[PDB]
Each structure stands twice: as C-alpha cells, then as structure tokens.
C-alpha cells in the first residue's frame, strides 16, 4: 500500500450468480480447440491452452492487450462443449427438481394451489414480513373456487407488501435478517420435501417414470409400470441423455417461472431476469487466464499445470465426440448400414459419459472415477485451500522471525532488535 | 545443555572481569540460575557438580551409574567427605566475590564441574528477516521458506487476536496492505474484476481501460472506438475505475468463473 | 443527465435522513480509545503530507508526536462520524469530545 496513491472507488457489496453461456461467449478473447499446449520449439500453439490471446506467456507479448508478462492482467477463454453437461455443484438440486415433475403437463406433481401458496409465502419472506406469511395460511374458505382463493391470496400479499413499504418499514430491496433467513430455509426445505412426496400430478393425474441417480455423470430413469400405464390411457433401467433432462427442466421452469422467482431469490428480483434451467447446465466451460495456469519450473525440470491437463483431457474428449457426430452426419444424408449406426451410437453414448466425467473431474476430484488431480473445489475447500490459507491467513512483508533472549535494562515496553533487522527492516517516511 | 535436561540458550557472553570470582581465583564458564532446579527437581545435576569438583580436585573419576548409592550412604555424604579431605567445604559451596562491586557475596556460592553439551540448534539457522522479495505467482503473496527469502505467516489465530485488540488498521496492514495489495480496474457497470483490459491505441492516441463484457463488437453496432491487438474493434465498455483489492481476490474470481459462478462487485461512487 | 440528478437527489435525501441532528445525539460524550487512536493516526498521516500545522513543533520530527501535541491542545480539524447499526450517524468534532 502507498499512502500517496489514493483510490477513489470502493466495493460496497458482492452478489452471487450463475455465469450464463451467452456472456462468456462475449467476454472471451479466444476459444481453445487443440488439446496440445505448445508445439515444437517450445512455442505456444495458437488456439491451444497457452494462447497469446489468453495472456503474455514466457517473454511473448499478449495478443489481446499487447503487453508483456508483467503488465498483462490475463484474459479468459472458453471451451465449446459439444453437449450440455451437468454442473457438479448444482447436480443435487437439479436431481431434486427433475423428480416431482409431470412430463405431460410440465408442472410439479404437487397441486398448483399449494405451489402458489408457497410462492406467496416465499415472496412475503422476501420483504421480511414473516408475520404476514402465517396469516396467509388463514385463507382457506372444485375448479373455480381455487382461482378465487389464489386471487385473494395474491391480493392479501400485495396489500401487506404495499402497507409495509409505505409504513416506513421496508425499502424496495427488502429486509433480510438471520431469523427471516432461517424461516425461508425452513419453508424451502418443507417445499422440497413436499414435492418429493407425490403419487401423480394434480393437474393431469398421470403417473410419471421414477428416476434414479446411480452416481454422478449418469441418471437412470425406471420405466412406467403396467398398472400405472393404464391410467395414462384412461385419462386421455433406461438411460436418459443430458439434452432430454435439459429440455424437461427448461419446460418445467418456463411453466413455473412465477414460483421459482421466489425460490432462487432471497431479495426482490429488481432485474426481473427469468430463472432458466440453462443455469444448471454448463454448455460452455471457462478457462482461466494463462497467468493462473503457468507451468512450474526447477532448473531443467519443467512441468505443465494440472488444470491444463484436465482441460486438455476435456478437449480431447470433445474432439472425439465431434468426430463421432461428423461420422453420424455423413450417414444422415445417405444411410447405409444401421449396424454401423449401432456401434457409432454406442461409442457416442460412451463419449457423452466420458466427457461428463471429464467435466466432473475438472471441477470436483471426489466426483470423478477411474491421488487424482485436484479440481477447482479441491483448491478451496479445506485447510491448505484458498480461503483458510491465502485469505484469512497470509504471508507478510516487513516481518522478521527470531529466537528470543532475555534482557533487563529494557524498558518493559521495548523490544531489543538486532543490527541485522535494523538494517533490513525499513519504514517509508515522506520527506517534509 | 547438561546431561540432566537443563537446556537453555546463551544470553550474554559475560566479560570475565564482570563475572563472580572465587577464593581460589577461578571464575565459572557457565552460569545457570538456581530457579531452574526447584520446579525441575534435577538433583542429579547438584550431585554431579559435587562429584565433578571432587574428582577434578583429587584427579580421579567417579562412577555415576544409578542405584549404587543407598538411603544410608547418600552421595552427598560421599562427595562431601571427598571435598573436605581436599580443603573445600562439605556442601560444595565456595566464597565468591562480585566482579562488578568487588565485595564478597551474601552467602557461599554453589559451584562445581559438570559435563555440558552444545546442541546443534544455532541462531544462524533460525533468524530471518524479509522486507521484500519473491512472490507466489498466482497469489502475489510472499513465498514460504527461510532459504527462499519468504515471509512469515499471519494465520487466522493472529487475525482474530488483531481483531480482539480493535486494531483495524493493523489487520489491514498485515493481511492486506503488505501481503498482496493491488489496485485493479473494475467495470463500474458490469461489476466484474477480470473482464477488463487495456487498449492498443493508434500512433498518437492514449491506451485506456475497457471492458469486454460491457462493450459491443463494432460490426454489430469515434470517441468510443477501441481496439485490441487482434484488431477486433469494439465500442463502449469505458465505465471502469480503480479499486484496491487483494490479488487472491482476483484469483478466487477466476477460479469461481471456472466453476460457472459470477461475482458482481458494486463499486460505491457511480 | 436527468437520471443522474434523480439518483443524486435520492442519495442526498437518504443521507439527510440518516444524519442525527446535533441536539439529539445520545452517545457517550467522551472519546473512545479507538476514536483517539484513529484521530491521531489520520492527523499524523495528514501532517506527513505537508498538511498545515496548527501547533508549534518544539524540535519534533515524528508526525505522530505532532498529532499528539495538537490533540492535547484540541486544535485537530477532524470530525468523528459515529455510526449506529441502523446506518444513522452522529457528528462530533474533536473539540466537543473529552479525552479520558
């Protein structure tokens, strides 16, 4: 820190959010396609992990900002994953949401009235009106009475919010304290638990297939039973791809926007951004600037970064699946033999699973399969991570360490320092 | 150290004229405080001093294997009689004089000969001072290691102690001001740390700071036009300002964007 | 130009509500240890940057000693903005507060 260099701005607050696939494609300076980091002669190959558009690297001027290694902040690239892959961080909540959904009507298996009640309670909790949330439950007195009940509940919630805002209590950005946070967490836990307890949809009473997550990287959906199949007529095991899950949850989230606006927001959503199921899928990975992926060196011993190894594995799997897609595409215009289609499709499914496992390993080591390279999560979680080892406790300048010896003739408020420390340690005194 | 676990570091090499001197003219080469024995109960050191003085006077060696003495024939009696047959007193004390004042001390001083070992823990292997030096690449913090001119660690248990004093500026000077302080440009509108960059100006222009995220590619859109080394021309993204942050914050933001998490920082003066 | 003026008026009005008037401040009349320490530190930092000095330096070269000398004679031109948890605040000049 230099007291002669004042800073005029200041960070007041931070907020968390999903990095949408559209924005990373715009902020990125270059995407990586070849899983070879640097070609012969040691030069970094363009389009690879070490690209001059991702930052200055080993006495090469950055292609983005034109600055050398000292003054190049670094720039982020991205990987165009061929298929949408599950985000390992959000996989559990995605698996919660996938269950308790009605594939037919594209709603939850819970009735719309109870879901609307929970949405109203959550919206009341957004403004800290925990009192009014339980008073909403005191509104209960076929198919047209429920609409009137919903209208009256919405009117009561709006009246409470408007009165509380006008009655000098709350502003547009809501009141968020610990107790209201505890009540919101309890209500959302009850909501999620209640969703998991259903037999069939309450808007079109047809049973839906029961999913089963064996481990990460794969979701297996059981087939509908014979007796349950009958009801789908009277009312008129299997693997599932990532794209099918994305489509199901995208439809569900588009239908139930009014309810998920209050499950994915603890404060009034002023931006009015819609909650999209794409947020749970990382269609495009983001590579960090090369400044954070530099290779380690000890004389002759030069080793590349582990994150580079993970990204190279991801790129290799991506090229493999792209080749398989091209092989299928050539036969799409002129189909010759379905057996070749059979084997190529089996290879494509294996490629899907392999690339999903690659993403899991790149983000979370413990979610991988087949000691391993630590992921991004493994770099932050425990002691020796990044929060406890480089933020809460850091190493400092202008500090000495030494073995102590006793000394009388010291004023009991003084420390006797050696001449070596007196020669090395310094203080910047502005000349006056 | 001695052979009884009485370890200790040297404090001052006392000049010989300032040391107490005995009636025989000798001055000790080791001073050990009497306040080390009562809580440690190393009476073996007392009796070893007695035996060492007796043996040096008589020019013999005394065996000190355990359980050769009894409660009847105490070693104090044996070595005291040996000392008395040579002139010195029974209890091993000697009349000494303070080397500063020159007067005789209040009582007789317990002095003898004991076997002393020099342990391999010197100070030249343990002292270290860092003003500046090398830094870790991805955190810009001082390196670890005395042999690498690396800084020492102010951990969490010192962080909470600094908080307890109420010394906020001491905490800012240790954890932030002199570990990895940097002034990073932040886009005031997009609120992202690492999405900004410099500009590659024409000959005669001035390189400014611009944001990729909050700018439009000029194809899809002359005082808002800026260019990068690749040549792709952009318009906008000129609302950025400096903020003092740790560099590990930038590294954390990068690793979080690798996870798909976006951190938006709201700067105060907008 | 008009959006910024609305933002400025809103921010200034919200700040004006926060400010507790001079005749309603209910905090302690003494100066806390932290307040005195930061007053001395900030005054010393200012003096180190060629700030005007309102006291006679009896052959002193330590800016912190100059700050202590000014604090003894209550010539420090600073104001403590004590903050309540709500965000409302009170303004006390160093002269009004009494040390220890």
């Amino acid at each position: 820190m230099d007291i002669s260099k004042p800073v005029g701005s200041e960070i007041t607050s931070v907020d968390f959010g999903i990095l949408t696939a559209k924005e990373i494609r715009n902020l990125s300076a270059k995407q990586i396609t070849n899983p070879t980091v640097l070609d012969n002669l040691g030069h970094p190959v363009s389009g690879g992990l070490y690209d001059l558009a991702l930052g200055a690297f080993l006495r090469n001027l950055c292609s983005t900002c034109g600055l050398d290694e000292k003054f190049c902040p670094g720039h982020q690239g991205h990987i165009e994953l061929p298929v949408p892959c599950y985000n390992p961080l959000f996989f559990n909540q995605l698996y919660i949401y996938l269950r308790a959904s009605c594939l037919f009507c594209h709603h939850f298996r819970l009735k719309s009235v109870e879901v609307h009640r929970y949405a109203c309670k959550l919206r009341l909790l957004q403004y800290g009106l925990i009192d009014e949330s339980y008073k909403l439950d005191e509104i209960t007195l076929s198919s047209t009475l429920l609409n009137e009940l919903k209208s009256k509940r919405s009117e009561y919630v709006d009246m409470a919010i408007a009165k509380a805002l006008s009655d000098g209590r709350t502003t547009e950005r809501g009141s968020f304290t610990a107790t209201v946070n505890d009540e919101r967490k309890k209500l959302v836990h009850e909501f999620h638990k209640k969703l998991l307890s259903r037999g069939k949809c309450d808007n079109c009473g047809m049973f839906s297939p029961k999913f089963r997550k064996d481990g990460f990287t794969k979701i297996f959906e059981t087939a509908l039973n014979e007796k349950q199949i009958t009801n789908n007529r009277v009312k008129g095991s299997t693997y599932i791809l990532s794209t099918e899950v994305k489509n199901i949850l995208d439809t569900v989230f588009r239908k139930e926007q009014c309810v998920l606006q209050y499950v994915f927001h603890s404060r009034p959503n002023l931006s009015r951004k819609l909650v999209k199921a794409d947020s749970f899928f990382m269609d495009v990975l983001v590579v960090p600037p090369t400044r954070f992926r530099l290779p380690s060196k000890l004389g002759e011993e030069v080793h590349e970064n582990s994150q580079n190894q993970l990204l190279s594995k991801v790129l290799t799997t991506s090229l493999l699946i792209r080749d398989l897609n091209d092989d299928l595409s050539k036969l799409q215009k002129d189909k010759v033999s379905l057996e070749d289609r059979r084997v190529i499709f089996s290879r494509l499914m294996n490629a899907f699973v392999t690339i999903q496992n690659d993403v899991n390993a790149f983000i979370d080591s413990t979610k991988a399969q087949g000691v391993p390279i630590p992921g991004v999560k493994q770099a932050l979680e425990k002691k020796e991570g990044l929060f406890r080892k480089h933020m809460m406790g850091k190493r400092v300048n202008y500090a000495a360490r030494s073995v102590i010896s006793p000394d009388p003739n010291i004023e009991t408020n003084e420390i006797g320092v050696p001449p070596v420390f007196a020669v090395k340690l310094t203080y910047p005194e502005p000349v006056t | 150290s001695s052979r009884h676990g009485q370890k200790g570091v040297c404090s001052r090499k006392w000049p010989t004229i300032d040391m107490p001197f005995s009636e025989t003219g000798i001055q000790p080469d080791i001073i050990i405080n009497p306040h080390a024995f009562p809580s440690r109960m190393t009476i073996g050191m007392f009796v070893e001093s007695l035996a060492g003085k007796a043996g040096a006077l008589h020019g013999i060696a005394q065996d000190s294997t355990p359980w050769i003495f009894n409660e009847d024939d105490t070693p104090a009696d044996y070595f005291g009689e040996q000392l008395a047959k040579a002139g010195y007193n029974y209890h091993g004390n000697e009349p000494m004089y303070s080397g500063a004042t020159g007067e005789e001390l209040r009582a007789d001083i317990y002095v003898g000969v004991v076997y002393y070992q020099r342990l391999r823990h010197m100070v030249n292997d343990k002292f270290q001072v860092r003003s500046t030096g090398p830094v870790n690449s991805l955190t810009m913090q001082p390196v670890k290691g005395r042999k690498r001119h690396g800084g020492i660690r102010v951990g969490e248990m010192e962080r909470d102690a600094l908080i307890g004093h109420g010394t906020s500026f001491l905490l800012q000077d240790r954890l932030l001001n002199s570990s990895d302080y940097t002034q990073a440009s932040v886009c005031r509108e997009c609120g992202s740390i690492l999405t900004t960059q410099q500009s590659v100006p024409r000959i005669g222009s001035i390189s400014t700071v611009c944001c990729r995220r909050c700018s439009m590619r000029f194809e899809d859109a002359d005082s808002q036009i800026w260019e990068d080394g690749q040549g792709n021309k952009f318009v906008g993204g000129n609302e950025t300002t400096t903020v003092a942050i740790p560099f590990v914050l930038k590294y954390l933001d990068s690793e979080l964007s690798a996870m798909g998490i976006r951190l938006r920082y709201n700067v105060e003066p907008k | 130009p008009e959006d910024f003026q609305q933002h400025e008026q809103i921010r200034r009005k919200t700040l004006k509500e926060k400010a507790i008037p001079k005749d309603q401040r209910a905090t302690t009349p003494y100066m806390t240890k932290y307040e005195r320490a930061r007053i001395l530190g900030t005054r010393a930092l200012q003096i180190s940057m060629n700030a005007p000095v309102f006291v006679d330096l009896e052959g002193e070269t330590d800016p912190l000693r100059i700050a202590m000398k000014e604090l003894a004679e209550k010539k420090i031109p600073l104001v403590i903005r004590r903050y309540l948890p709500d965000g409302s605040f009170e303004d006390w000049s160093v002269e009004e507060l009494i040390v220890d």
């Binding site: 260099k5 004042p6 800073v7 005029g8 701005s9 | 001035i206 300002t241 400096t242 003066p269 907008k270 | 130009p1 008009e2 910024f4 003026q5 400025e8």
Partner: peptide, 18 residues
C-alpha cells in the same frame, strides 16, 4: 498521468447543455 490526484474519479452531467 491519469491518476486520482489529476483526473476526477467520476464526472456526471447535471443538466442538459445550455
């Protein structure tokens, strides 16, 4: 050059040009 001691941190227009 381009320092907080030289250039304003933020500059906004209050009214329309007149």
């Amino acid at each position: 050059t381009a320092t907080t001691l030289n250039t304003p941190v933020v500059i906004h227009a209050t009214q329309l040009p007149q």
